[PDB]
Structure formats: structure tokens, C-alpha cells
Amino acid sequence: IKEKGKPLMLNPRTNKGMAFTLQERQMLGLQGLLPPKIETQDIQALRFHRNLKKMTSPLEKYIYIMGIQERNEKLFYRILQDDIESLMPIVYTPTVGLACSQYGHIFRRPKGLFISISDRGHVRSIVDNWPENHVKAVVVTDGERILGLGDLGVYGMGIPVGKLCLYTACAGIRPDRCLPVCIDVGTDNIALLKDPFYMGLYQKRDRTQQYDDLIDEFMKAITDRYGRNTLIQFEDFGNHNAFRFLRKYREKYCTFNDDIQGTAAVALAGLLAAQKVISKPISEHKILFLGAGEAALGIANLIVMSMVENGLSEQEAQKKIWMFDKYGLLVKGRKAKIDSYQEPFTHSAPESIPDTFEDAVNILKPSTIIGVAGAGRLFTPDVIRAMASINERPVIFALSNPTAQAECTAEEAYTLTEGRCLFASGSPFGPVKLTDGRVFTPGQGNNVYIFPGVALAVILCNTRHISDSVFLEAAKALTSQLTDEELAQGRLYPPLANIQEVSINIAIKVTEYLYANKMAFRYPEPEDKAKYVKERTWRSEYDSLLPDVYEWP
Amino acid sequence: IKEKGKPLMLNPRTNKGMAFTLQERQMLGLQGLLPPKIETQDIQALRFHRNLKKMTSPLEKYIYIMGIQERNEKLFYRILQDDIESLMPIVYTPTVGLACSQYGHIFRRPKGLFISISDRGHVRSIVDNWPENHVKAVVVTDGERILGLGDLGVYGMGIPVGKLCLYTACAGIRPDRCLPVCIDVGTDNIALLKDPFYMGLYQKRDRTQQYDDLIDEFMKAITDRYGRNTLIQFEDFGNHNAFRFLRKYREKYCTFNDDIQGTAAVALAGLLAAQKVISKPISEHKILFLGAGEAALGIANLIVMSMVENGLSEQEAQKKIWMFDKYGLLVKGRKAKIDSYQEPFTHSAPESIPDTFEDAVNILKPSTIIGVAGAGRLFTPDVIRAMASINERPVIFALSNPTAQAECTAEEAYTLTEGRCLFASGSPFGPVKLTDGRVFTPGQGNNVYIFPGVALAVILCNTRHISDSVFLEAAKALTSQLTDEELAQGRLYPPLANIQEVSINIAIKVTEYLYANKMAFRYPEPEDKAKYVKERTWRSEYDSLLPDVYEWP
Amino acid sequence: IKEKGKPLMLNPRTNKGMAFTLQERQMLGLQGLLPPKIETQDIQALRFHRNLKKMTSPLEKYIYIMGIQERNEKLFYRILQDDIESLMPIVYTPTVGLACSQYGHIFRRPKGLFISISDRGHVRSIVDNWPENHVKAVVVTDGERILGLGDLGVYGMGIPVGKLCLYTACAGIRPDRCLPVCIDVGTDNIALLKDPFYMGLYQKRDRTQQYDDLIDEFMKAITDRYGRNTLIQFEDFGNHNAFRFLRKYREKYCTFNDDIQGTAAVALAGLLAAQKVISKPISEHKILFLGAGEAALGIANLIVMSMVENGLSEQEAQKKIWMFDKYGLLVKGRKAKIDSYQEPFTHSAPESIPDTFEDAVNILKPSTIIGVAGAGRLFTPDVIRAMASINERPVIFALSNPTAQAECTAEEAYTLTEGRCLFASGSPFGPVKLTDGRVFTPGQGNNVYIFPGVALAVILCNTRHISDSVFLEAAKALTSQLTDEELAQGRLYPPLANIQEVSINIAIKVTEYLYANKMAFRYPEPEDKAKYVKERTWRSEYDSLLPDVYEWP
């Protein structure tokens, strides 16, 4: 703390509000700049809930709380902490999307770094404009696939912002060690191109080699200022760029892709919980995806990794996996192009080629169904009814976000199958009570349950590169925290209310693995990995800003 | 003060060195940045004299002491206060001239504002670059007539730097409210033009109307930012611009010319004290200047103002005043040009036309003699010898600076006239003991006896303009402080060792005059003019930097 | 650079003087604050040498140039770079000793950090008061053994300040990445305790466990703020604490002791160059040391390392090593205590036990003689003349600092041995021209030829701990640059004039070593170690402070 006076109030990283003690007020030059009352964070919190309770819409509530992050960081996280479960729908999915598609409308103060293609050749100078000088985690996007909402361009910065928020409020990463980034090379969305409030460059997306040079220049500039092992979580890019950049950097930097690997870990964990109820013989496992993109391909590769670790060869495991997209079932020889990653899951066409998804469900007769198209309610009743007929305890997962692009709802799943299903969603749904009294409390298959804890571990361990096994491990660490009681409620995931510890427990496990596999470079190595982790978490409790004053002998 | 940490030590205005208390060091973030020992200004003062004692050259001493002002302001001034009389020939005349003509060689750090003709049109932006924001006094030079040293261009910035030191060291004006300025419009100095160390524009002097507009743009800029009554002391300009600018701005801005008006006040003062020993009849007062420029015409004018107050008509007064320049005696109808200001003292040629200055002395047979030609030892022994024969108690004033251009030395004056002369020099000279044992201690006719005290008065009173009678009053205030004892030693001026109180005393008389003549605008008017002035002087003693801590009931 | 205006000129790290470009002046808010002239660093340097050439005494020159570092860092090192060989005796030995002994008299501004025993419990807050936040190299002292000058207490800070200049002027390490530190736990020097100018705590040295706890708390505090692999070079401590702390830390931190290890590496390299002229049968090597302290024991262990690696067992190698201190020859069973470290060189006494050092020379008849007592001319003419006889080409090494404490002079060594000796001094000595016309050019065995390059490497490779072989290598890397023609002058070391490349070259060798031995953690590993190193050296040429301004398509 080298600053004194008003600046201390202007900076939300330090603004305490009326919680500034008199000692600090007088000693740092704030006396007379604050009301003669000294408050506790406890009161400050009470003020918030009292006010939030009166608000009506979620976008209005979202605007409010997010602004607190602009006024008082400590109280901001204190307020989340007070109840992350009831505030997640506002700050995360589904209302976060609504805010992104409104970003230019609700704009008040910016957040994160903004690098546009028109800045190429000077990406370093921009990075040098960032205030915090010890960043450890970056979350970057270009806004081409914001959830299932599509190309939102610069209005997409609300995603990294929202994600980094969860790093801290979930895994205790330090707010000032995070940096959300947005690369603006344009947007193809005709609509924002005509909008006057738009915050980005008014041009279509540039896909020439100039685009790639920029991300190259971006990655270099970042690591130069902050270090080669700076964590870089890629978020919401377009399918080609997602894998493209993943495979191209995963070996040179400490980077990963949330949509591909993050989602893989979560899904495998819910599926793992489910098996605990089904106990369906490996041999008889058939999985069918709705959509074959970033997320589908990712989960598929992790599902395989786990099936392999349980006998089955890599080849025989993939043959148990099918994918259906917007062009239809992925069978060998089809007209619609099949890419490198899809090949292992592209099989020889069956006897009857499914025209509709219900067809594929009826023909392939899968044990599990996973929605990852982000195209809406494609999990029709005829489908859930079919799955209800083919399998006694069918596995239905609808994970597209937000809730509008969700393949189906919790209500539909449990009622259309007579509560014989094992359900999970990407967005939030409340408990469902059947006409006959049975109550089913679904869980939420969101990578929010994974990236905060993984990131922590990777950071604390000074890891230089991330391998997919880490996510496999992570997934194991998560499901391993599920209790048969929570499970006996319809949950394939531990209560959201406990995502804070769950995340910590996750992070503890991952560091054990990282160190055990010689992937961690933090030295020396802690003897008790647990104490180690808990020791370093950030707290929302105010810190004294008083100068170290003492008398000498 | 609004900041903490190292900056506190980098800034001389606040730097205390080891004099920072422990409570200060701990409460301002300095613990560790200073040795574990706390000192007193007294000790630091001891560190200075011990060191200064070992030095051998005056320019070496100049560079050392001037360097303190850039390290610890308060200590710097405490060191002058310790013995102004011995340091004066180092910081002021004559060593200061040596320094100026060497400004480029000894450069270490700049001081003051630098406005060049190349910045015309953007002089205000320059004025806004100045750190201190409550300037009250300015001393400006363009470097055309640095003492009797001539045109030194930007090397002449040494003068405004020194002059403003005296403001503080002599009259207690605050250091941060002073601003030395230099107008660089080129230099005609052929040698400096070929000097790779010169600090100004490598071009000859611009005398076009562009020169005049620049000064106007400067006078407008200054007053806009700091105020219309900000004091501007013009210093060491060329003859022409000296008068031209004084006449043009004196009734529009709170401005004055030291070389014209300040020099006037000192000389009259010494001329008055003298009269006390001679008591020569007003009727027989004949004066003869060696030089008819800035200083000569300023004295001549003030002399006349008093002669008048004492009877004499303006016309008759002037008739008792002659002038002799580089061309000869100023007589009506001479080849060389005479100007608006000389006319009054340019009289009808005498029976014979003096070819040398000795002839002029022999012909005119003057009572007084005033050297202000800045041309060296023109008061030859034969002249001194002649003055002694013509008068019983002749008056010999050689006021040109620095020492090397003085018209004659004290030893020459006293010895060559058998100790009957009444002498005053512009630069410092020690006591003279004739072969007959008589010891004479001469005084220094220098406006440093004037400007610091008059400037303090105008400022405090919020004066908007300075009339000639203000100096008339300052001269009366100075001499009125001389005691017959010091008088008896041969000094026509209070000892230099008391310049600090003489100055204040002068400031009090003048602040009484201004008020009494409705020229002061400071409100309300102080009852006790003396208590009021001494109440607002700047002290060289360290002030406490501690925040105002205290407990609430 | 985050700040503009005055602050830019007040901080020596950024201050450029009149070299600030007009665009920089206009764009950073310095227009007007600097004279209208734009100077080149080459002009500024010209002013320095011209000013320096006038000065007479070395301590006067020391004050001048060390002052520049507090004015304009960039020019400071350029002035060094311009001729490190001639300014070395002024900035380093012997004139740095003279300055340290008078630190309190010449004090103007402080340097480095100051941790006193009175600050125990708050060393972290003191560390957090340091401006620069990316320190990589520290040099610490307590001032108990400043050279061969003794306990100088806080007046000892002049050593780490000077050591750290070499880091940059020799190896190109970044100035702002360096931090000198002084631990003040008191002083036993009676005189400084009654000196009002002293800069440290007025108390005798505290040697309780409170002393250790402080170093413990210093060590921890430093590594926490700046990182665990931060280089910590220990300098000039007391014999007991030197070794004690070395062995206590060398494996917990990235730390080394320059007096022990540093000097070892330099003495071996001069001794290795010598062997190339003597080619003496390893079997017939007999080494005798004057003194058995920090340095003496240091070279020994390395000498043995070299010997071992060329055959000889640990045992037989140390048998060839004899040490003679203030109590006499170290023989088994003597009164004066022998310590853990001296043992291996504490041999069974000879037939006649030497009383004088001349005896030990005449009894043992050594091939080499190494002066490291720091007690003055103990290498009397009789000893020099005794060596001259016993050996055809004796090796006489007087390494005590400063020059007054040197065991003998170059003039004595060559003259007293007929020029048949191989001499090396701790401090500088010029060439010696015998009566017979022969001219001998001695070399300087000082660890300055070592710590600058060895530190560079350790820093660039992100090394965690320092082994002794590092020095063995660095010692091998230095002598390997000696050219026969140079050897043919009498120099067992490469010219001083090229200390820059030498250091760089040593640095390259050492990093190749670290990488080759799994001690380097910088990743990835460079392909061309040489290009890698030359790549990252700090230059003295000014850098453009201009903001990145560019037009968008």
C-alpha cells in the first residue's frame, strides 16, 4: 500500500467504505472524507441483501452486484460468499448471457483488457497498460461462440469477466492475479454491426493469417510480462480455432481450453456418479451425442480414457460412441464433412440411417444421451419417452447454455420418464415433484465445478503444461465427493452450496497428482498437500491497512 | 503533503535526510530507506561546514552548496542562515558570474522555467508544466546583460536562480512560491555559438517584433495561471528592452526592474548616509556618472526625486547631474546619440570638452563620482587623486559587477585619498588599513539590500503595481538603519551580517507606505504592521510531517 | 514508465538530462523544465571526463561519480563503461575502503536497504518499503570485516553498493534488479561509537541468538517478496558467521559467500595460469598461506579440488597445504584452537616449529606463498628473498585489501626476486621496470573477475542452489581466456580493460555447466548458450520513453 488519500477510496481493490477504522482514516488521510460512522462488513452485507431483495429482474440484480466489484472488491466477494448458490444464476448462467447480448446497453465501466486486430504489432504496449503487475491467471475469448448464443463479438467480454469472478469466489484465487481478455478482430453478426452501442470494431471477422499472427503476438506478449507458466484458459472461440490453438499451444504454454477439456471433466464425473446407481456392464455401454463439436468431442475422448482405464481397448471404446449433428448421424462415407477429431467416432453406417434424432435413438438404442448442440429443445418428449422405453434407467444430459438452448428441462425429463431417469443440465433448474409426490433434485453439469479448482492447483504447483489426464483426475476428484444421500435425491453432483470446498478438495487432489507425476515445479514440495492449499486461499475479510509502527528499545 | 515513500526523499522540498523521525519513517513508508540513525539539522549543518572547510576553490564551493538546494531545501537555507556574509561572495557576486559563464561546463540539474522563441504560441503549455502551483514571485532574464559580463544567453539562468535564493535567505519569502525564468531568443555571443556545451538555441538574437510578442505571451501566460498581481522582477536585460518593457508593463502588471529601480534605491541610501558626514550644501551638489545606462539613469532619477523633496526644482536637480559614457560627456549637440531618458541630464557643453574621464573630473569638479559602466577599472589613480584634491571628503562609488569590472578597489580609494574618501563597491571588499594604521571598513552598494525586502512587502500587501516612490521609501528605510558607530568605520550601509533583519525591517516600512497610500489590497489591514510581517516569514527549521492522529471521546 | 513531468527527472532511473528528445519533452510534460538544448549521451560523457580531469584527490572523484548514479543511472554506467580500468581504483579497491571509513562524513543521499536489530519482528515491512519490485540479486553485509579494515559497522554499506555496481558494469545485470543490504546489529569499533556522524545503532554488536533470528527473518522476508531463487551474495561478515551462515543456507536458498568461494575461484585461476609457465610436478607442490581465515580456507578447498581432479587423493592434496595465522603455524597439538575447517590443513608439526613467518618459509620451503591476513606487509624482503632462493620461479600472492594491508608490493616482489617471480595482488599496482630495463605487468587477483559473471549465469538459468564446482568451473573459465602474450607480460589474468567480455564469457561457460548438470531451471533450454546470454545484457544507451502512438486502418 503505497497510496494515501482519496485514491484509496477510488480503487475498489482498496476501498473499504465506512469499514475504514478511525486509526486508518486518520493515518492514511481519509478523515472527513467518510461519514463519522464506522461500520462492519457484517452491516455492509446486511445493506446489500436488504436492497437486493427489493429488486425485481435478474438483469437489474446482475447490474447491481457486478457494480460492487467496481466499488468494493472485498465486499463484492463477501456478498457472493454469503450465498453463491442463489447468486450464480444471476452472475453466471443463464442471466450472464442475457447481459452479454446487452453489454453495450448496460455499460458503465469497462473490465479486462481489449486487444483488437488493429493493434497488431503493438500488443505488448497494450499489455503494459494493465495496472496489476503479477497476473497468474488469464481467461481469453474472441466472442465467436458465447455459450449457445453465437457470435457476440466484444459484447462477449462478460464471459471471461464472469469466469474469473468464479476463480476467486470458488477456489480463492487472488482477484488481482486474474486478467480477463478479449481479442476483437471483428464480428460477422449483422445485428451488432448495425448497433450504435456496440463496443467493438465495426467490421466482419478477419480470418486471414493476420488473425493467427495476432494470437501468436498476444501469447508472446503475455508471457513476456508475466511469465512462461501464466495460466491461460481459452474460452468460447469458434470450433476450428478452439482445437487449432489448443493443439498449437498446449505444449508451449500453460494453456487449456475450458469448453473442450473443462466440460469433459464435469460430464465424466456425472456419468461416473450415475454408474453408481446403474452399474451397467461396460460391454453394454452405448453413448449418443446431440452435436459433435468442441464439447462433444472433448467429453467423448475423456469417456474413452476412463473406459480404457477399466479394461476395454481404445478402439473398442470409441466404437461404443456415436455422434449426431446438424447434418445427421456421423457414419463413414456421408456427404457432410468429417474432421480429424471426429474420425474415431465416425462409424460404418447402420442398417437404417436415422433422419431425425428420435430415429437415431430408436435405431442405435443408446444407454446415454448427451445434449451439446446448443440448438434448443431437441430432446423432444418422443425422445425422452423413447429413452424411457429402451432403458429402464436412462441417462439424459442436456448441457447447452443458457436455459433457452437447453435440449429439454428437468420437469420434462423426470415426468416424461416416470422418474426413472438420471438427469443433469448445463443451466439451473429447481427440484421437480411428480404427480405422485416423488421429488427429484437434479444436479448441474457445468465446468464451473472444475476450472476453479484445477486452475488453483496448476497455479500453486508452478506447472508448465497441462495434460488431459489432469482433467481425468479432476473429474475423479469431484465425483469422489458425492454422498449417497445427495445421490439418493437425483444429484450426480455435490450441492452447489458447497462448491467452495469442493473446489478446494478438487485442487488438493490435482496438486497431489501433479507432484506425483513430476509435473509440479513449486519447490520445495509440501509434505501435507492439504494444509498447503488451504494456507494460500484468498479471504474476503478486510485486511488492516495500518502502517507498521513500533517503539525501539 | 499528499505522498509517501521514496518520493518524499527524491523531492528536496520535502527531503529531510536522516533528520526524519522514527515515527515519520514508519508512518510514511521510509523505514529501511534511511540508516538506523536519526540526526538533527544541527548535525547536518555540522557535516556541511566541516566539508566546505576542506574545499579549495570558490566555484568548487558554489557547485557544492548550490547542489544542496537540489537535495534538501530546508538544510540548504539553514546553511546560508548560518553565515550569509561569507557565503554571499560564493552564491552571489562575484562567484556567481564565474558560474554563469561556465553554466554549460558545470551542468548537473536544471532549475527554473525555460521559454524559447521556438515555443512561441505554446508558452502557456510551458507555464503549466511547472510543478508548484501557487507561485507569487518571478525573476526573469533573457541573458543579454549578465552583470558587466554581457550576453551569455541561457548560461545567464544562474542569475535568476541566485536572485531568488536571496528572496528566501534574506526576506523569508517561501521557496515554492518563487520561479526563476529564462527567455531564450538566441545569443549574439560568437564563442557560445561554437560551444558544444551551450544550453540554449544555436542562433543569433531575434530582435524582430516576434521577440516582443513572445514576452507579451509570457506575461499573459504567467498571470493567467497564477494571478494578475504576481510579482515579476525583470533582471539583466539589454539597455533598450530594459526601459521599453518596464514602461510598457509597469502599469499593467505588478512588475519592476531591479537593475534600474533596485540599484536606484541602494545608491541613494548610501548617498544619504554619506551626507550625514559631509552635510554638503544642497546648492553645491554636483554628481558625475561613469556610464549612462540602465543603472546610471535609474539612480539619477531617484537622486532627483529626493533633491526635489528637499527643495530644488526638478529642472535644477537634473542640472546638478552629469553623465559620461563610452562616447564621452553627454552634452547637447554631440555626434553620438542621446535618448528619451538621457535628455534631462544631457546638458550644454562646458567651456572645454573632456576627452578622458579624468578631464571630465577636472573640468566639472564633481563632489560625487559613480562608476556603473561595467567596463573595468576606469576610476584610475589619477582620477582618485584628482577627486581627493578637488574635495576634502570626496565620494567614490564603483558599483559595477563583478569585481573584475569594478571601477576601482577599496584599497585604491582609501589609500589614494588618504582615507578621506567615502566609498562603496558593487562587489565585496575587505577592510583596509593604511600604512598609518587607520582601518577603514567599506560597505557594499548592492540592490540585494533592496529587492528582497521590497518584494516581501508588495507580496504580503497584495499590491498590483509598483511606483518609483516605493523605492524612494525603501532607500530611506535602509539608510535609516545605519548607526553612527558602523558609520564611523566607513560603512554607509548596515553590516551584511544583518541583511536578514534589515530586509524584514525594510519590508515593514514599505508595507506601511503601501497601505498608507492605498496601494495595498490585502484585507483586512493589519493593526500592527510589524507583528504582521514577522508573523509570515518562512523558517529554515524542519516541520513535522506526521498525520493528525488522535482519539475520539 | 507510469509517470510524467518532474518525477521523470527526479528519479535517476529515468532522468536523461538534456538528452530527453523534444518529442519526449512535449509528450511527457517536461517542456520548459529543461534548457532549449538537446544533448547526446556522448556530449554528456564529454563533460564528465573534462570535469573529472580537473579533480585532484581520489575520494573527491569517488564522491563525484558515485553521485551521478543518484542523478542519471544510464550516464553513470556509460561513464564507467568508457574506462572501467581507470575508474576501478576509485569505485572499488582501494578508494572504496577509504570512503567506507568516512561514510558519515561524505554522506549526501542513502543507498540500499537498512535492517537493524531494533527492527526484528518487522523486517518484512522494511523489505516492502523497497521501490523496485522485481529484485533478482542482493549483496548483504553486517560490516564486521570490511576488507582488511575491520568492523566499520553501518559505514560498511559502501561495500554492497560498490559490489552491485560491478554486477552491472561488468556482467550487464539490471540495476533495478539489484538490492544492496546492511544488517545493523551494532558495532564494537570504539571510535565509531563516539563518532556523532556514525549512521548505525550506537551499541556494541549483539551476538545472542537474537542476531541469528534476524538473519533468519531477513532471509525469509526477502525470498517471500522477491522469490526463492533470488541470489543472495553474502559479503564481509565475521569469520564464525561467514561459514556458519554459508553452510546453514547454501541448500535452502540460492546463496553464496563471496569472500570464501569467490576468492577461491580467482586464486585458482591465477595459480593455473602460473602452472603454465612453471609446469611443476604435481607431486612437488607445496603451498603456504599467511592467515587461515575465510579466504585462506576457501582457496585451499578449491586448490585441493583441482589437485584431486588431476590425480591426487583428497588426503594427499591437503597434505601439500600448510597455513600460518596470528598464533603461528597450524600444527597438530598446538595451543591456539583449530576449527572444523582448518583441521584438514592442520598437520603434524615439523622438526623445528617456525616462530616468524620467514621461518615457516625457510623450514617448509613452499613453492607458493599466498597472503590473506589483511595485516600489512608481512611478506618482508627477507621472505621475498628467501622464496627467491628456495625456488627458481617462486609464486608470491599478496591478496589483502586495501593496498595498505597488502602483504607486499609489485615493485618489491619483482625487484627483490630479480623478476623470477609470478606475482598477483588483491589491489592495483602499475607495471614495474627493473634497473635492467625489463618491464613486468602484474595481474589483479580479485573476485571482481568472478562474482559478476557467475551471478549473471545463476540468475539467467533460474538456478536454485550453488555448489562449489560452479566456482571450480568459473575459475577454469577465467584462466582459459588468458593469452600467452599476456602471460608473457607477467599477468596471470586477462587485461582489466576487457573485464566486460571476460565476465560475459565466464557467464556463458557457467550456464552451459549448470544446464549440463541439471542445476538450471530456466525453460526451455537455449540451443546456443552464447547468443542466449549476450541477448539479455543491460545496455547503457538511453531508451525511448515515447508512448506507442499509431494510426488505425
Ligand SMILES: NC(=O)c1ccc[n+]([C@@H]2O[C@H](COP(=O)([O-])OP(=O)(O)OC[C@H]3O[C@@H](n4cnc5c(N)ncnc54)[C@H](O)[C@@H]3O)[C@@H](O)[C@H]2O)c1
Ligand atoms: N454445460 C457446460 O459445462 C458447457 C460447457 C461448454 C459448452 N456448453 C454448451 O454446448 C453447446 C455447444 O458447444 P460447442 O463448443 O461444442 O459448440 P460447437 O458449435 O463447436 O458444436 C456444436 C455441434 O452441434 C451441432 N448442431 C448444431 N445444431 C444442431 C441441431 N439443431 N441438431 C443437431 N446438432 C446440431 C453442430 O453441427 C456442431 O457439430 C453450447 O450451447 C454451449 O453453451 C456447455
Ligand SMILES: NC(=O)c1ccc[n+]([C@@H]2O[C@H](COP(=O)([O-])OP(=O)(O)OC[C@H]3O[C@@H](n4cnc5c(N)ncnc54)[C@H](O)[C@@H]3O)[C@@H](O)[C@H]2O)c1
Ligand atoms: N497548502 C497550501 O496550499 C496553503 C497553505 C496555507 C495558506 N495558503 C494560502 O494563503 C492564503 C491565506 O493567507 P495567509 O494565511 O497566507 O496570509 P495573508 O493573507 O496575510 O497573506 C497575503 C498574501 O501573501 C502571501 N504570503 C504569505 N506569506 C508568504 C511568504 N512567507 N512568502 C511568500 N508569500 C507569502 C499569501 O499567499 C497571500 O496571497 C490563502 O489564499 C491560501 O491559498 C495555501
Ligand SMILES: NC(=O)c1ccc[n+]([C@@H]2O[C@H](COP(=O)([O-])OP(=O)(O)OC[C@H]3O[C@@H](n4cnc5c(N)ncnc54)[C@H](O)[C@@H]3O)[C@@H](O)[C@H]2O)c1
Ligand atoms: N551594484 C549594484 O547594485 C548593481 C546593480 C545593477 C547593475 N550593476 C552593474 O552596473 C554595470 C552597468 O549596468 P547597466 O545595466 O546600467 O548597463 P548598460 O549597458 O545599460 O549601460 C552601460 C553604460 O556604461 C557605458 N560605458 C561602457 N563602457 C564604458 C567605458 N569604457 N567608458 C565610459 N563609459 C562606458 C555605456 O556607454 C553605457 O552608457 C554592470 O556591470 C552591472 O553589473 C550594479
Ligand SMILES: NC(=O)c1ccc[n+]([C@@H]2O[C@H](COP(=O)([O-])OP(=O)(O)OC[C@H]3O[C@@H](n4cnc5c(N)ncnc54)[C@H](O)[C@@H]3O)[C@@H](O)[C@H]2O)c1
Ligand atoms: N516490466 C516488467 O516488469 C518486466 C519486463 C520484461 C520481462 N519481465 C520478466 O521476465 C520474465 C521472463 O523472462 P525474460 O523474457 O526476461 O528472460 P529469460 O526467461 O531468458 O530470463 C530468465 C530469468 O532471468 C532474469 N533476467 C533476464 N535478464 C536479466 C538481466 N539482464 N539481469 C537480471 N536478471 C535478468 C529474468 O527476470 C528471468 O526470471 C518474466 O517472469 C517477467 O516477470 C518483467
Ligand SMILES: NC(=O)c1ccc[n+]([C@@H]2O[C@H](COP(=O)([O-])OP(=O)(O)OC[C@H]3O[C@@H](n4cnc5c(N)ncnc54)[C@H](O)[C@@H]3O)[C@@H](O)[C@H]2O)c1
Ligand atoms: N506484494 C507482492 O508483490 C507479493 C507479496 C507476497 C508474495 N509475492 C510472490 O509470491 C512468491 C513467493 O511464493 P508464495 O509465498 O506466494 O507462495 P508459493 O511459492 O507457495 O506459491 C507458488 C506460486 O503460486 C502463486 N500463488 C500463491 N497463492 C496464490 C493465490 N492464492 N492465487 C493465485 N496465485 C497464487 C505464487 O505467486 C507463486 O508464484 C514470490 O515469487 C513473490 O513474487 C508477491
Ligand SMILES: NC(=O)c1ccc[n+]([C@@H]2O[C@H](COP(=O)([O-])OP(=O)(O)OC[C@H]3O[C@@H](n4cnc5c(N)ncnc54)[C@H](O)[C@@H]3O)[C@@H](O)[C@H]2O)c1
Ligand atoms: N583479493 C580478494 O579477492 C579478497 C577477497 C576476500 C578477502 N580479501 C582480504 O583477505 C583478508 C582476510 O580476509 P578473511 O575474510 O580471510 O579474514 P579472516 O579474519 O576470516 O582471516 C584472517 C586470518 O589471518 C590471520 N592473521 C591476522 N593477522 C595476522 C598477522 N598479523 N600475521 C599472521 N596472520 C594473521 C588471522 O589469525 C586469521 O586466521 C582481508 O584483508 C580481505 O580484505 C581479499
Ligand SMILES: O=C(O)C(=O)C(=O)O
Ligand atoms: O457454455 C459455455 O460457454 C461454457 O464454457 C460452460 O457453460 O461451461
Ligand SMILES: O=C(O)C(=O)C(=O)O
Ligand atoms: O549587476 C547586476 O546585474 C545586478 O542586478 C546587481 O548586482 O545588483
Ligand SMILES: O=C(O)C(=O)C(=O)O
Ligand atoms: O576484500 C574483500 O573484502 C573482498 O570481498 C574482495 O576484495 O574480494
Ligand SMILES: [Mg+2]
Ligand atoms: Mg464457454
Ligand SMILES: [Mg+2]
Ligand atoms: Mg542585474
Ligand SMILES: [Mg+2]
Ligand atoms: Mg569482502
